[PDB]
Design a protein around this ligand. Structure first.
Ligand SMILES: O=c1[nH]c2ccccc2c2ccccc12
Ligand SMILES: [Zn+2]
Length: 208
């Protein structure tokens, strides 16, 4: 079902997506432990993920959410890192991708900071790092993230230092209160509320 289309780096669509990736890198409180030490990425490839059944699953669910929230899907584009991106792009999101120990419950987590999603590319807390070098800060191996269309609907606002949504909500917003430089994180509880739109292949870059 899924087919992947290479975007040219001269295409505006590519550039828009790259810019969203580069401009939402921040520093992490773990000093780079989970995700590596870097200020920027080497973007190697960006692919559009095209799957009819998964798209229609998304848009059908989105209409439902919209109708339950003053005609407002509250659709965002957000990052998702995972060692199972190959399974997500082919079969879509489901409970297997839920973060069971998540601070805002057992749901599927997304980030506004590309660097936050980068922390989960090799598993929770970076796992054991890249398969080839067992290095969480590997500058050599290729990483992949997803840049997804996520339907948030009415989103429970949780300030902060597969389950169900809170009643009358379609998602949760984890908004950092302490780190003012940290962007929001969002959780959904149905896989049908995200479409994995772009697969981004990259390396983290070692700082000068
Ligand atoms: O991109 C993410 N991928 C994940 C994969 C598995 C578990 C948790 C997360 C997660 C948590 C917070 C923010 C972003 C992410
Ligand atoms: Zn490596």
């Amino acid at each position: 079902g899924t087919i992947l289309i290479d975007l040219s780096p001269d295409d505006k669509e590519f550039q828009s997506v790259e810019e969203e990736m580069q401009s939402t890198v921040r520093e992490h409180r773990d000093g780079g432990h989970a995700g590596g030490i870097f200020n920027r990425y080497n973007i190697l490839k960006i692919q559009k993920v095209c799957n009819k059944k998964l798209w229609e699953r998304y848009t059908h669910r989105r209409k439902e959410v919209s109708e339950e929230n003053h005609n407002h899907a509250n659709e965002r584009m957000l990052f998702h890192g995972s060692p199972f991106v190959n399974a997500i792009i082919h079969k879509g999101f489901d409970e297997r991708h839920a973060y069971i120990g998540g601070m805002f419950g057992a749901g599927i987590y997304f980030a506004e900071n590309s660097s936050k999603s980068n922390q989960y590319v090799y598993g929770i807390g970076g796992g054991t790092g890249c398969p080839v070098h067992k290095d969480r800060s590997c500058y050599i191996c290729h990483r992949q993230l997803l840049f997804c269309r996520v339907t948030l609907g009415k989103s429970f606002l949780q300030f902060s230092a597969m389950a169900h949504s809170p009643p009358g909500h379609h998602s949760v917003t984890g908004r950092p209160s302490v780190n003012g430089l940290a962007l929001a994180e969002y959780v959904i509880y149905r896989g049908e509320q995200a479409y994995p739109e772009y697969l981004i292949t990259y390396q983290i870059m070692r700082p000068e």
